[PDB]
């Protein structure tokens, strides 16, 4: 079976607005979300629907952009690095599960290049 998706809201966590967090939602997430290669990354990988029975043998930290978007929207992240870590986990999950050169991998590589171009201009801490 699939695991439950990652948590996206916790009312007991403290909340802050920061320029870094705003940029991560309004520039980084938004830019990747609208990209023509985004759709396979907009929700959790459904290993049941996609017939990937071994997916969770190696992917012990699932992540996707739908989860990241919701986390940003619900003030789940305190430090910008928490969000950056989640993007990076999404990419690196893809590269450990899927054969090099598979279409999903080439899509993730293009998205990661774009992510790094946007993260380059992240506001200071």
């Amino acid at each position: 079976m699939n695991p439950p998706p990652p948590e996206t809201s916790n009312p007991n966590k403290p909340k802050r607005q920061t320029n870094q967090l705003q940029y991560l939602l309004r520039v980084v997430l938004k830019t990747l979300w609208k990209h023509q290669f985004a759709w396979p990354f907009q929700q959790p990988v459904d290993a049941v629907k996609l017939n990937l029975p071994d997916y969770y043998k190696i992917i012990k930290t699932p992540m996707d952009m739908g989860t990241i978007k919701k986390r940003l929207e619900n003030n789940y992240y305190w430090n910008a690095q928490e969000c950056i870590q989640d993007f990076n986990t999404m990419f690196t999950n893809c590269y450990i599960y899927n054969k090099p050169g598979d279409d999903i991998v080439l899509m993730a590589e293009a998205l990661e290049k774009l992510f790094l171009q946007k993260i380059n201009e992240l506001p200071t801490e």
Binding site: Q36, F37, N98, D103, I104
Partner: peptide, 10 residues
Amino acid sequence: SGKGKKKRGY
């Protein structure tokens, strides 16, 4: 063992 070939979105 993989997800197959992919189509792009709009």
